[PDB]
Amino acid sequence: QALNEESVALQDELNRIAETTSFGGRKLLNGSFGEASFQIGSSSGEAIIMGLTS
Amino acid sequence: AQSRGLDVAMRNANDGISIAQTAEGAMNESTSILQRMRDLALQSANGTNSASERQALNEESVALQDELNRIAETTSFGGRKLLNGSFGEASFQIGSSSGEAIIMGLTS
Amino acid sequence: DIEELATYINGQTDLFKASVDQEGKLQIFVAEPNIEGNFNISGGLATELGLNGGPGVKTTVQDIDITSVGGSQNAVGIIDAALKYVDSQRADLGAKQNRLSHSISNLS
Amino acid sequence: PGVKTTVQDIDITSVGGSQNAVGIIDAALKYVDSQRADLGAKQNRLSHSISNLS
């Protein structure tokens, strides 16, 4: 039971990490980030998609 | 008139030099990418890798491959794609009169 | 993927400014001097994306919106075309200025 | 179809619970490490792109 209490505490910690880590208010590790394109070229297109899964 | 021709020829030669310089820089970065990919493949070759390590190495390799494609398709001298395979053989008047030209070609 | 396809389409030509919006919808931009009539598209790939080339949506600089990713990507091509047009007009004015100077010297 | 078990669905109050827990956490670790490797590949891609652009 004590080990399970520690395990559930760590589970809640994992959920808090998933829901909290953010880049200036843009949640990163909660699935909501989806996929975004960073335009690294110097003209239309020329971008790179980024994957970040919950 | 020949002095004007010499001035324009010097300008054209300098333009060709700049195009070659930009292409050379892109090529240097591409060869760095290829060296990194070679290192990745050699690391993958080692016997003690199971399967997941090979998957991670393959993910890195495919990322570098798409980076190579992006470089080949993106580097440009003011809207003139260089290494995307479209430049082909092009002339560069470097003489006062008509009939002087250095042919430069950049394969994709 | 869609982004690589957009980059490739941009590379293989200079009359198009391919782009990708937030949802991943290929935005193809054709500068004003480069189009006159019904821009018609074909091929199996276009049916794969469901594209439909027709009269097109007319967008000028005054109609630029940036709040969306696709808005910015389209705006890139819009400003590119606008810059090209303004530079062409400035070139025309410079040519007229040079002709005027030559004429004034001849008149004197 | 099999009973779906995720990390959040982990309990160790019984021997079988922990025996399933080891495997569940191993799978989760594999997933997280794969995503980290993908992100590292993206970082290397972006660094090479930055050097090329410079």
PDB file of all heavy atoms in Angstrom, chain C residues 14-16 30-36 39 84:
ATOM      1  N   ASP C  14       9.297  29.767 -60.454  1.00  0.00           N
ATOM      2  CA  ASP C  14       9.385  31.104 -59.885  1.00  0.00           C
ATOM      3  C   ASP C  14       8.116  31.918 -60.083  1.00  0.00           C
ATOM      4  O   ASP C  14       8.060  33.067 -59.630  1.00  0.00           O
ATOM      5  CB  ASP C  14      10.573  31.863 -60.491  1.00  0.00           C
ATOM      6  CG  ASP C  14      11.910  31.285 -60.070  1.00  0.00           C
ATOM      7  OD1 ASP C  14      11.951  30.552 -59.060  1.00  0.00           O
ATOM      8  OD2 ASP C  14      12.920  31.564 -60.750  1.00  0.00           O
ATOM      9  N   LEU C  15       7.100  31.366 -60.746  1.00  0.00           N
ATOM     10  CA  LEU C  15       5.814  32.038 -60.872  1.00  0.00           C
ATOM     11  C   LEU C  15       4.863  31.700 -59.734  1.00  0.00           C
ATOM     12  O   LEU C  15       3.857  32.396 -59.559  1.00  0.00           O
ATOM     13  CB  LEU C  15       5.151  31.673 -62.205  1.00  0.00           C
ATOM     14  CG  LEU C  15       6.069  31.606 -63.430  1.00  0.00           C
ATOM     15  CD1 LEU C  15       6.623  30.205 -63.647  1.00  0.00           C
ATOM     16  CD2 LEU C  15       5.332  32.082 -64.672  1.00  0.00           C
ATOM     17  N   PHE C  16       5.156  30.657 -58.963  1.00  0.00           N
ATOM     18  CA  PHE C  16       4.327  30.228 -57.847  1.00  0.00           C
ATOM     19  C   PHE C  16       5.033  30.540 -56.537  1.00  0.00           C
ATOM     20  O   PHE C  16       6.263  30.473 -56.455  1.00  0.00           O
ATOM     21  CB  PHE C  16       4.049  28.723 -57.892  1.00  0.00           C
ATOM     22  CG  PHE C  16       3.259  28.267 -59.085  1.00  0.00           C
ATOM     23  CD1 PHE C  16       2.895  29.138 -60.096  1.00  0.00           C
ATOM     24  CD2 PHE C  16       2.895  26.941 -59.195  1.00  0.00           C
ATOM     25  CE1 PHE C  16       2.177  28.693 -61.182  1.00  0.00           C
ATOM     26  CE2 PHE C  16       2.181  26.494 -60.275  1.00  0.00           C
ATOM     27  CZ  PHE C  16       1.822  27.368 -61.273  1.00  0.00           C
ATOM     28  N   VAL C  30      -0.173  33.230 -57.091  1.00  0.00           N
ATOM     29  CA  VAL C  30       0.288  33.615 -58.418  1.00  0.00           C
ATOM     30  C   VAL C  30       0.303  35.134 -58.480  1.00  0.00           C
ATOM     31  O   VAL C  30      -0.751  35.776 -58.374  1.00  0.00           O
ATOM     32  CB  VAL C  30      -0.599  33.029 -59.525  1.00  0.00           C
ATOM     33  CG1 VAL C  30       0.060  33.215 -60.878  1.00  0.00           C
ATOM     34  CG2 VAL C  30      -0.877  31.557 -59.259  1.00  0.00           C
ATOM     35  N   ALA C  31       1.490  35.706 -58.660  1.00  0.00           N
ATOM     36  CA  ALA C  31       1.615  37.154 -58.711  1.00  0.00           C
ATOM     37  C   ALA C  31       0.798  37.710 -59.870  1.00  0.00           C
ATOM     38  O   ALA C  31       0.556  37.033 -60.871  1.00  0.00           O
ATOM     39  CB  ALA C  31       3.081  37.558 -58.855  1.00  0.00           C
ATOM     40  N   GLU C  32       0.374  38.964 -59.725  1.00  0.00           N
ATOM     41  CA  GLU C  32      -0.562  39.544 -60.686  1.00  0.00           C
ATOM     42  C   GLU C  32      -0.036  39.521 -62.112  1.00  0.00           C
ATOM     43  O   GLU C  32      -0.766  39.062 -63.008  1.00  0.00           O
ATOM     44  CB  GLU C  32      -0.912  40.971 -60.257  1.00  0.00           C
ATOM     45  CG  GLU C  32      -1.888  41.670 -61.184  1.00  0.00           C
ATOM     46  CD  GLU C  32      -3.128  40.841 -61.458  1.00  0.00           C
ATOM     47  OE1 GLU C  32      -3.554  40.090 -60.557  1.00  0.00           O
ATOM     48  OE2 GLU C  32      -3.676  40.939 -62.576  1.00  0.00           O
ATOM     49  N   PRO C  33       1.182  39.982 -62.406  1.00  0.00           N
ATOM     50  CA  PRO C  33       1.643  39.963 -63.804  1.00  0.00           C
ATOM     51  C   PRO C  33       1.757  38.568 -64.387  1.00  0.00           C
ATOM     52  O   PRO C  33       1.778  38.429 -65.616  1.00  0.00           O
ATOM     53  CB  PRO C  33       3.012  40.655 -63.737  1.00  0.00           C
ATOM     54  CG  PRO C  33       3.425  40.573 -62.310  1.00  0.00           C
ATOM     55  CD  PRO C  33       2.165  40.614 -61.511  1.00  0.00           C
ATOM     56  N   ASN C  34       1.827  37.533 -63.554  1.00  0.00           N
ATOM     57  CA  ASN C  34       2.069  36.174 -64.014  1.00  0.00           C
ATOM     58  C   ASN C  34       0.794  35.397 -64.320  1.00  0.00           C
ATOM     59  O   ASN C  34       0.885  34.228 -64.709  1.00  0.00           O
ATOM     60  CB  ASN C  34       2.883  35.407 -62.967  1.00  0.00           C
ATOM     61  CG  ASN C  34       4.285  35.954 -62.803  1.00  0.00           C
ATOM     62  OD1 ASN C  34       4.649  36.953 -63.422  1.00  0.00           O
ATOM     63  ND2 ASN C  34       5.081  35.301 -61.966  1.00  0.00           N
ATOM     64  N   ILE C  35      -0.383  35.998 -64.156  1.00  0.00           N
ATOM     65  CA  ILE C  35      -1.644  35.298 -64.375  1.00  0.00           C
ATOM     66  C   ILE C  35      -2.587  36.213 -65.140  1.00  0.00           C
ATOM     67  O   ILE C  35      -2.671  37.413 -64.860  1.00  0.00           O
ATOM     68  CB  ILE C  35      -2.283  34.844 -63.044  1.00  0.00           C
ATOM     69  CG1 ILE C  35      -3.728  34.375 -63.246  1.00  0.00           C
ATOM     70  CG2 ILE C  35      -2.270  35.979 -62.040  1.00  0.00           C
ATOM     71  CD1 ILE C  35      -3.829  33.017 -63.888  1.00  0.00           C
ATOM     72  N   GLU C  36      -3.301  35.636 -66.108  1.00  0.00           N
ATOM     73  CA  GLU C  36      -4.356  36.358 -66.816  1.00  0.00           C
ATOM     74  C   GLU C  36      -5.326  35.312 -67.364  1.00  0.00           C
ATOM     75  O   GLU C  36      -5.050  34.695 -68.397  1.00  0.00           O
ATOM     76  CB  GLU C  36      -3.784  37.226 -67.924  1.00  0.00           C
ATOM     77  CG  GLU C  36      -4.837  37.922 -68.773  1.00  0.00           C
ATOM     78  CD  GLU C  36      -5.919  38.581 -67.941  1.00  0.00           C
ATOM     79  OE1 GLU C  36      -6.809  37.860 -67.445  1.00  0.00           O
ATOM     80  OE2 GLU C  36      -5.880  39.819 -67.785  1.00  0.00           O
ATOM     81  N   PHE C  39      -6.785  30.153 -64.067  1.00  0.00           N
ATOM     82  CA  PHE C  39      -5.655  29.316 -63.676  1.00  0.00           C
ATOM     83  C   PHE C  39      -6.169  27.908 -63.411  1.00  0.00           C
ATOM     84  O   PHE C  39      -6.687  27.617 -62.331  1.00  0.00           O
ATOM     85  CB  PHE C  39      -4.977  29.899 -62.442  1.00  0.00           C
ATOM     86  CG  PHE C  39      -3.732  29.173 -62.028  1.00  0.00           C
ATOM     87  CD1 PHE C  39      -2.484  29.707 -62.293  1.00  0.00           C
ATOM     88  CD2 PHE C  39      -3.808  27.961 -61.366  1.00  0.00           C
ATOM     89  CE1 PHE C  39      -1.339  29.043 -61.910  1.00  0.00           C
ATOM     90  CE2 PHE C  39      -2.666  27.294 -60.982  1.00  0.00           C
ATOM     91  CZ  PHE C  39      -1.432  27.834 -61.253  1.00  0.00           C
ATOM     92  N   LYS C  84       8.214  43.245 -56.189  1.00  0.00           N
ATOM     93  CA  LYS C  84       8.597  43.142 -57.592  1.00  0.00           C
ATOM     94  C   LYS C  84       7.968  44.266 -58.406  1.00  0.00           C
ATOM     95  O   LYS C  84       8.637  44.913 -59.219  1.00  0.00           O
ATOM     96  CB  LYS C  84       8.184  41.779 -58.144  1.00  0.00           C
ATOM     97  CG  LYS C  84       8.832  41.432 -59.481  1.00  0.00           C
ATOM     98  CD  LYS C  84       8.770  39.940 -59.828  1.00  0.00           C
ATOM     99  CE  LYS C  84       9.231  39.033 -58.692  1.00  0.00           C
ATOM    100  NZ  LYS C  84      10.510  39.491 -58.085  1.00  0.00           N
TER     101      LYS C  84
END
